[PDB]
Design a protein around this ligand. Structure first.
Ligand SMILES: O=C(NO)[C@]1(F)[C@H](c2ccccc2)[C@H]1c1ccc(-c2ncc(F)cn2)cc1
Ligand code: NA
Ligand SMILES: [Zn+2]
Ligand SMILES: [Zn+2]
Length: 380
């Protein structure tokens, strides 16, 4: 049976200015996905679990103690709990934003009453779901959560992220069940800079990212194809970095190709016990630059899910990251759950199945395959 998780206290992460219309990562996002799964009957066919807030201890598997105190507590307990006096002056952190609200940098918001609780709830939800899949309690699942995580570095918050939920889920799986091999696939359009960092030296976790890279001119700017890992982790960080811009913009045929020639042969060789997916939906059409630029169809994500379900005995869990256009994220989310339930998938266009991938995608896929041919039997 297939699990879902969702909680309305994540709807309170909102800017103090009062109008969410100044901010792309908005409460409406998870809210609309949720009703789409309800009215299409997909939700009623899933186990809906009670999520919780993550502990500071759990958060500290990935993030510094300082960072966890800062972004994980309300003002009163922040001071009470910081007995080590790790934090400096809050005046050094908070900025005012153009919209009139309080920020942490030039565009990441902070609600001193609600953001800490919502962020820990995002991590806690994903953890619970993941642990249910790893222990045989469920087959698979989808985490409908916010704020997002994959940009959240050890002690630095960016791109509307504060705590890398997926990275935390992974560490706990290692620490508390000793899961020997985990795959993290990240298909959000942006590189998952945080996740890469959290496992760069760790060969028990394979991080595979499909993103728009463009000579590092696209947010966050990280994730180049030769960033292959360090130490024992060499080979176990794979950046399927697309380049050459929108000439043309990348689509279903380019991604399906990437999956066939790059992602799945490495995934299969690696042979993991649990697949985790940073499931962002900004690669779907309707996401103008810098938000996206690509022209994938929400349907395609159903098919990508189904390829990954073939790995790890079916032990797969997906967790929301980016995605903005409501129709786009709602269509894509429906596709993913639908695949996860074992349903027959809404078909792809005949033109798309027959299309050869554009030149820039082939140039991009070649670079990767030459770089990683050193580390994997399947590409040599
Ligand atoms: O998709 C994302 N991450 O995977 C984002 F970071 C954030 C987003 C998340 C969810 C909904 C809507 C948006 C979008 C994003 C993309 C680019 C920037 C950015 N920031 C600074 C800059 F100079 C250029 N681009 C910021 C946020
Ligand atoms: Na990515
Ligand atoms: Zn604001
Ligand atoms: Zn994104």
């Amino acid at each position: 049976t297939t699990g879902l998780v969702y909680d309305t206290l994540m709807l309170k992460h909102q800017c103090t200015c009062g109008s969410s219309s100044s901010h792309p990562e908005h409460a409406g996002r998870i809210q609309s996905i949720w009703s789409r799964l309800q009215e299409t009957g997909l939700r009623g066919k899933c186990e809906c679990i009670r999520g919780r807030k993550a502990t500071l201890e759990e958060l500290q598997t990935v993030h510094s103690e300082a960072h966890t105190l800062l972004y994980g507590t309300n003002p009163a307990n922040r001071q009470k709990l910081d007995s080590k006096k790790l934090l400096g002056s809050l005046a050094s952190v908070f900025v005012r934003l153009p919209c009139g609200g309080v920020g942490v940098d030039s565009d990441t918001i902070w609600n001193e009453v609600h953001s800490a609780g919502a962020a820990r709830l995002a991590v806690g939800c994903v953890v619970e779901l993941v642990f249910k899949v790893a222990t045989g309690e469920l087959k698979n699942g989808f985490a409908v959560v916010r704020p997002p995580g994959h940009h959240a570095e050890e002690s630095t918050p960016m791109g509307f992220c504060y705590f890398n939920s997926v990275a935390v889920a992974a560490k706990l799986l290692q620490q508390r069940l000793s899961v020997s091999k985990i795959l993290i696939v990240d298909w959000d359009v942006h590189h998952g800079n945080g996740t890469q960092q959290a496992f760069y030296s760790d060969p028990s976790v394979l991080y595979m990212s499909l993103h728009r890279y463009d000579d590092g001119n696209f947010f966050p700017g990280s994730g180049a194809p030769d960033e292959v890992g360090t130490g024992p982790g060499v080979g176990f960080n794979v950046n399927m970095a697309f380049t050459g811009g929108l000439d043309p913009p990348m689509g279903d045929a380019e991604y399906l190709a990437a999956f066939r020639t790059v992602v799945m042969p490495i995934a299969s060789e690696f042979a993991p016990d649990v697949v985790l997916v940073s499931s962002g939906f900004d690669a779907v059409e309707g996401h103008p630059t810098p938000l996206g630029g690509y022209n994938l169809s929400a349907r395609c994500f159903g098919y990508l899910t189904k390829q990954l379900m073939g790995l790890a005995g079916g032990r797969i869990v997906l967790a929301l990251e980016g995605g903005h256009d409501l129709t786009a994220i709602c269509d894509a989310s429906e596709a993913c759950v639908s695949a996860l339930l074992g349903n027959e998938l809404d078909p792809l266009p005949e033109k798309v199945l027959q299309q050869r991938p554009n030149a820039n995608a082939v140039r991009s896929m070649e670079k990767v395959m030459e770089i990683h041919s050193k580390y994997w039997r399947c590409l040599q």
